[PDB]
Design a binder for this molecule. Structure first.
Ligand code: TPP
Ligand code: TPP
Ligand code: TPP
Ligand code: MG
Ligand code: MG
Ligand code: MG
Lengths: 526, 526, 526
């Protein structure tokens, strides 16, 4: 008779899973014992760092990732990272261990109380099974709920005595099941949409993160060339969906109600693909749209379609809808739009560096197929203007605004794409939230590059206190941190850059190295 | 007309509050502006470190502490620390900022979705108000629910546009309200209990953490001297409730069902005060009690009284019940029990240190009124046998077993007791969960001592894999960390100890220093 | 070996339970089979009627009641009745059946999905056990959580295959456990309260429903005679706590903010016992209290103490606090207050009846130890002025305002007090919500009297539309119902009254009858 342990590892290998991300405990020892030789284990020193590494690996490979944590204390330390995963639509399977079934009622040490309620309201599905023989059917529901459109995180809690009991022999029917959500709009209604696009006199296009997740980038290039139309990215962007030096590209939209209606004035039809309508930030009251403009939206999430304050909407898969529209529209006889001008070069003495100077130097020296990550909050507009990104899968930024994402996520992307060089740009404030993730890069020899921007302050918060007219606020400055000593503590090589000739030398050394490297850069205090 | 901002800071000063523990954000700038000169602000670099410092300050002062965090991402990073606060009964008031009321429905950047459900099921009370004028009445309910028996943590969420609006003038009736739960059992039923204690022929006493929280230690010494009875501490102990070298004291109980019924065999009446019945750990099946033994329990928590599997129970305040019993019982004519023997000295060469040798050296050199903290998981039984603790408020250990408590909590205790020296003993594994808290000690010049026990492994997990017969488990070792380099990174002085003569020299230097100090100790690999 | 079925019925008989209230189903047949001869079963035809009958029985006997329902559909039909039970503090144990453990995951017919979340937020405690051997320990927690101060309703869900399995032999330690919450304030603080009462120059007293629940009525009479002080009942009253023709009694308080501060002007100390502060209804803005008045409150519920907008508070048992204060205060030398005048008699022709005429006729003819219930919404002030109620346990009204309480509750009170005659007064609108409860009185021969007040309209709603200035509202009238035909349908004797001489004859017949009786009365349309 096969055990619950033997039946569960056979379901995982037949559904394509071969890696476990974790930090271990008492309640997990009977799951992890006798570990099979066709799987690999990746250790990290804190639970915010475990979930960040797994999130980077899933976004870059376009497939689900598997995680194992300890009871209530371990699940609780990770709830900030699960807030970023809800808004990026990331497919993550989260498991945690519970006490033996005979000692839950007396509340022994290590018991998880009312367990399915702890991660609500951040997850798609949450459960604790009623018997040992139900555990393989519960793992089947979790795999399929994470992978169906719209994609997201899920939770399962298991008592430690279940793994050594006998399984149900009829569980073999689960092993090779296949589920599809790859759908598009009916022929009669799709015909009405194409006729409206073919007769517009001044059209415009807006793109979001679900375009890069689906690999629909090349189909969106064909659509803009046929219509002869300008292209923008939607506000607070988590990914890059279009080549940034193509003649149709206009850059990042402003995040206010009145600023967006003035930008769209004079366009008769506006088409949105794979974004919310819209992720606003500052308070800027006015009109949602001006007279003469109509809007149409395509999305994978029913909650996005319901909460929009203007326009018509369609709920379907982004890959199947983009392929259909690109191959049906006519070639317009209008002329192609003109490419944006070359950015201005700013004046630089032989002391402390301007942020504009750091981005121009990276664009001259790095390879054409590099991957970038951003957690430098006061410099985002300059980064989008000065880096040429030609290929898919080339940019990531925290999707819900939560700090502690970019340092551990850069280690996960480099393990999924071993032939492309990864480069993470991070502020002095943001670097402390997840500092212990540096140990995982040194132990498994993963060659990421980390660039630290040191200005001595929480820079974006001083800017916003100015616009709200708020005086005498405490806690805005962070003096007296040595980032070269923190790297030596966890086993990582460290370099420094105080002027332009030191910055050029340090980047050329880092491109040649066989292990991970950190560089500390002195930047101008606003 | 007074504003909501002016009315809320007047309610806090009249109820005895003068300190704020925090990490700031966009949604909190209109609460923190114009900060008043009779309050102080304490900054930390991550939200697990903010809540740990506040928990140490509240436990040592015996009064409530006030906290301020940013939206869903900040609340989520702290949920592991709120798991420890539920089981220790700590009085903590947690506030977080929300988006402007006109932009919640469209879900703008920084919106907290279904906010009151996020920290359930860990808190006593959770709420988001319906209008700006209701905010001062909501802060009144939060202060009183945290302070009533049984004490615990609470949650409030506030939209940022509420602080500048007009208050209700009838809010002045809140300023000086007083609420009491200081109660004990009726005269007729208390008389029946005292008669049963006076006629027992071989009584025994068991004590828990709610005795030290109430300062009832001296009343429990008088009770044991009158009855002439032996005294134990209940399993997995979070605090110390009795002097450890008094002749009646027998030490820490074992954590198994069968081991506890054999220890109590031959005692006719057993009295428990201020503990659960009981916090078991390992699986050890048998009898709850043997024939001839009856049990009676006094507790402040109705859920503790309901879930016990044996005995009678009384629900009341621990301070008022201990004072009443101590002054009513008769003097027995039995002889006082004999004191425990002096511990054995183990053999030591001039290389790597045994844990037994480290505890004997601290007992010879430290002052008589020192305070200790423990997060060295494989050495807890040796620590309770070898340290003489004469006074109240002298020991703290993680109440729900969650790692990341002792390093930040040691900084909070030293700020509440500036005339007593604090000394924290911590393992190589446990030190990484909350490492960035070291910056807060250097910036505010708080003189704590940190002792690190370096064996290269997760030692308690290797021991338990032996007893469960579990072979080929991954992720149990942590090589290649330099703890002297991590201290220099955050601005803290560092020393080392590789033999007995180096350990004696390093402790004498640390007792003289005016700022914080870390010592790295080489210990024997099991 | 004893089964789970045998062990559970032995725990119920040793804790004092001998009656089951229910409506049966598929999932409950293995609990109800082999029913033991020392228990009785009471059937009703709908689940709102089952819970109403049990609520009346528990309030009149001052002990807990046991209930059994079918899965999600049966639990759902009863949630209006559980809203009334939360605000009256009623001790009710609610159980429901679930599908076999092997078919919960596939969601077979009759499965209850996420079961513990369904009755939140109305209950004190809610749970579904992890194994068959845990079921007797889960029933122990439910009995004790319902009975501890403050008292209220609880919920347990059980899979049908658990009842025939082997029990744990160590479950015998549960059978005779005893838990007490009978507590009062410490000697030093009680002394400060008595000194403030002894030196007041014009005191006043206010009483709520927790006084009648505790049987503290005679101790509150002694307190008012010693202080020489006037006595009021708090607004929207669910029970009667004082004799209504004693010289100190002043009647029912108005339900507005400004109306209550003007009534208390000139009183220096106001003492509240066993009520919320206060249950307001209409909008009436002004001062909470006027200059020269201080307030002090005694309550059994921490949420009542936290939410009051003015005064000091004490949390303790109502029976133990009333006995202590009554025996400690001094005899004042002031003169006793004067009794209220005899009510005015209104003019009556020989046609349709005024409500004032119906209440004067009941006070002349009924016995001195009768029990009354009220669900006639537009006539409550006239009922409190015209009925003389000398003894405890003599009045009940819906505690949360929810219609469908009084008809089934009158059947439960008559089964607990077989030597006192019960008389229920009910409106034409209110009688339809729970009409099928009439069958239970006829089948078990329970002799309640039902008086129906027929005016053809929702009378209280027409009055409130006048004060809000609301015109052209639909759905306010209910013509064409025959209440004598509905009684004959369910097997109950029926009489009628169209003038004063027919009303006197019908009441004298009903006082003599051996079974239940309904009387239909024609009343004046406002
Ligand atoms: C968990 C969490 N805590 C706090 C914040 C608020 N926050 C927004 S921007 C910022 C400052 C980041 O400073 P730094 O990385 O040095 O970049 P700079 O602004 O100096 O360019 C902070 C603290 C947040 N978004 N998430
Ligand atoms: C947040 C959290 N993660 C994981 C654990 C599981 N855990 C229990 S003891 C232990 C090992 C601690 O090792 P160290 O501090 O070096 O002490 P030693 O056992 O070597 O004496 C771990 C990881 C936990 N209790 N809490
Ligand atoms: C379940 C429920 N539905 C509706 C109401 C609203 N309601 C309050 S008073 C009332 C009218 C009752 O009319 P009737 O019993 O004839 O008495 P009358 O007002 O004519 O004296 C209604 C419907 C309620 N309280 N509970
Ligand atoms: Mg900065
Ligand atoms: Mg170790
Ligand atoms: Mg009516």
């Amino acid at each position: 008779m096969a055990s619950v342990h033997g039946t569960t590892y056979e379901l995982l290998r037949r559904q394509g899973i071969d890696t476990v991300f974790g930090n271990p405990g008492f309640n997990e020892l009977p799951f992890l014992k006798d570990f099979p030789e066709d799987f690999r284990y990746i250790l990290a020193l804190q639970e915010a760092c475990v979930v960040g590494i797994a999130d980077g690996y899933a976004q870059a490979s376009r497939k689900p990732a598997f995680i194992n944590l300890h009871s209530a204390a371990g699940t609780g330390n990770a709830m900030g990272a699960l807030s970023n995963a809800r808004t990026s639509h990331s497919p993550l399977i989260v498991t945690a261990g519970q006490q033996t079934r005979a000692m839950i009622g007396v509340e022994a040490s290590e018991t998880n109380v009312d367990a399915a309620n702890l991660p609500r309201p951040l997850v798609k599905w949450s459960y604790e099974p009623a018997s040992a023989a139900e555990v393989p059917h519960a793992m089947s529901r979790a795999i399929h709920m994470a992978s169906m459109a719209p994609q997201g995180p899920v939770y399962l809690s298991v008592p430690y005595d279940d793994w050594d009991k006998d399984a149900d022999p009829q569980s073999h029917h689960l092993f090779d099941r296949h589920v599809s959500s790859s759908v598009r709009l009916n022929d009669q209604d799709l015909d009405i949409l194409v006729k409206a696009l073919n007769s517009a006199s001044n059209p415009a296009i807006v793109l979001g993160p679900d375009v890069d997740a689906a690999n629909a980038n090349a189909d969106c290039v064909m659509l803009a060339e046929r219509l002869k139309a300008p292209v923008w990215v939607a506000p607070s962007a988590p990914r890059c969906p279009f080549p940034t030096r193509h003649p149709c590209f206009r850059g990042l939209m402003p995040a206010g109600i009145a600023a967006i209606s003035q930008l769209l004035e004079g366009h008769d039809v506006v088409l949105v693909i794979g974004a919310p309508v819209f992720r606003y930030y500052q308070y800027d009251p006015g009109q949602y749209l001006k007279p003469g403009t109509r809007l149409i939206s395509v999305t994978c999430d029913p909650l996005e379609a319901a909460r929009a304050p203007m326009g018509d909407a369609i709920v379907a898969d982004i890959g199947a809808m983009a392929s259909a529209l690109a191959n049906l529209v006519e070639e317009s006889s209008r002329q192609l739009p003109t490419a944006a001008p070359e950015p201005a070069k700013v004046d630089q003495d032989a002391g402390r560096l301007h942020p504009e100077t750091v981005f121009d130097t990276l664009n001259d020296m790095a390879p054409e197929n590099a991957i970038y990550l951003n957690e430098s909050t006061s410099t985002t507009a300059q980064m989008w203007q000065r880096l040429n990104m030609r290929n898919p899968g080339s940019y990531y930024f925290c999707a819900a605004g939560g700090l502690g994402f970019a340092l551990p996520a850069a280690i996960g992307v480099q393990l999924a794409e071993p032939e492309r060089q990864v480069i993470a740009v991070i502020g002095d404030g943001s670097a402390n939230y997840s500092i212990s993730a540096l140990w995982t890069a040194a132990q498994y020899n993963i060659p990421t590059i980390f660039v630290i921007m040191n200005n001595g302050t929480y820079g974006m918060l001083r800017w916003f206190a100015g616009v709200l007219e708020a005086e005498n606020v405490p806690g805005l400055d962070v003096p007296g941190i040595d980032f070269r000593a923190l790297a030596k503590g966890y086993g990582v090589q460290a370099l420094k850059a105080d002027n332009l000739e030191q910055l050029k030398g340090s980047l050329q050394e880092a491109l040649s190295a066989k292990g991970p490297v950190l560089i500390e850069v002195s930047t101008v205090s606003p």
